[PDB]
């Protein structure tokens, strides 16, 4: 009766859903007669089809998994999102968020991130030992690691691209490595182009990984979770992924290689984006603008419970999810988690889909699956990306 849309649908992320269910009872106990109705929708389905449709028709869920940047800006300007500054003041929470920028439109706040993310390279410390390689810090090191991994029968990069957004993760970072993080805002303001040779350098580097079989071959047939299977079952030396992936990686009778799992920032390439890491405060929950009194009370309770040090610590301890809020203790965690916090000290850039329009993101997904399938060249990809980028920029008016 009060709808709570989330994307925690995989069995592997059961602890994250169980936390949502705990939050849902606590809301119900706080608000008599309240009935919370959790609805899980697969991430890409929720974000790129279901929720955009509901927003256009004006009937979004009351509480919903929401992304900052482009998505929030679109629903704000359509009047769909509850402004959260009165509530944040009531609860004393506003300044326990180090970064709400993706959710701030004209100084006003329309969502709350539940996590801080980084994206980089998970690796198997025991496979690296076997191959007698150190952590690769630059491109030519990476090539050596990948060549030795493959020579020994390991997949260099566990990789699955049936879900198109997965292919864009390492890509994001590759073209930002070569062209700098300012390339992506440049795309939407018309001062940088997808076809520019410094952008293209990162695409060609990605294609080199394809051409050498360092990105897992046959990946177009595999759903996102399959790259995590390959890595956690010890078949791949590395996997480029987000920090949220540890919720599916390192516990119990699934994971051969739990303690020898590590993480490093992607090697430098001698380009304008060296020394940076993909990360930010992008994903959390938004709230319908159409809330009545019980509904608002439920949303306030949800905020009070979810955005607390108790729940932030719980999801860190249980599932490795890095906190979006300021914490008191935060101590005692898996090595891979130290290594991620370590790697997050670098200069940061947000995911490209927080900056570009939906149509551009969708086109990059489809273009990369064609590139992975050998059905488009890098030249064709960037030509098409730039045309769509021009159209999107014009349609912003
Ligand atoms: C709070 C949390 O852990 N959210 C995770 C999401 O961030 C993640 O989705 C992906 O996040 C990237 C970083 O913002 C985006 O660039 C990427 O587009 C996005 N993917 C989709 C399909 O929206 C998902 C992955 O399933 O896990 C969440 O738990």
Numbering used by the authors: 49 to 445
Recite the paper's sentences:
In conclusion, we identified and characterized Paenibacillus spp. NagB1 and NagB2 proteins as SBPs for chitin oligosaccharides. Binding experiments of the recombinant NagB1 and NagB2 to several oligosaccharides using differential scanning fluorimetry and surface plasmon resonance confirmed that both proteins are SBPs of (GlcNAc)2 and (GlcNAc)3. SBPs, a component of ABC transporters, are responsible for trapping ligands that are imported through a specific pathway formed by two TMDs, and mainly define the specificity and affinity of transporters. The structures of NagB1 and NagB2 were classified as subcluster D-I and contained two α/β domains connected by a hinge region consisting of three strands, with the substrate-binding pocket located between the two domains.
The crystal structure of NagB1 in complex with (GlcNAc)2 (NagB1/(GlcNAc)2) was determined at 2.0 Å. The asymmetric unit of NagB1/(GlcNAc)2 contains two polypeptide chains (A and B). There were no disordered regions, except for the nine C-terminal residues, including the hexa-histidine tag of both chains and four residues (Asp299–Lys302) of chain B. The two polypeptide chains were virtually identical and formed the same folded structure with a root mean square deviation (r.m.s.d.) of 0.57 Å for all Cα atoms. The overall structure of NagB1 adopts a typical SBP-fold consisting of two globular α/β domains: N-terminal domain I (residues Thr49–Thr162 and Ser330–Arg395; Fig. 5A blue ribbon model) and C-terminal domain II (residues Glu167–Met324 and Ala399–Lys445; Fig. 5A orange ribbon model) and three hinge regions composed of antiparallel β-strands between the two domains (residues Ala163–Val166, Ile325–Tyr329, and Gln396–Pro398; Fig. 5A cyan ribbon model). Domain I contains five β-strands and seven α-helices, whereas domain II contains five β-strands and 12 α-helices. The ligand-binding site is buried at the interface between domains. In both (GlcNAc)2 bound structures of NagB1 and NagB2, the first GlcNAc interacted with the tryptophan residue Trp213 of NagB1 or Trp217 of NagB2 and formed hydrogen-bonding networks with surrounding residues. The O3, O4, O6, and O7 atoms of the first GlcNAc formed hydrogen bonds with Arg95, Asp401, and Ser330 of NagB1 and Arg96, Asp408, and Ser334 of NagB2. The second GlcNAc unit formed a CH/π interaction with Trp292 of NagB1 or Trp296 of NagB2. In NagB1/(GlcNAc)2, Arg64 interacted with the second GlcNAc. Although the structure of NagB1 in its ligand-free form has not yet been determined, considering the conservation of a.a. sequences and three-dimensional structures, it is likely that NagB1 undergoes the same structural changes as NagB2. Thus, NagB1 may trap (GlcNAc)2 and induce the expression of chitinase genes, such as ChiW, via a phosphorylation relay in the system.
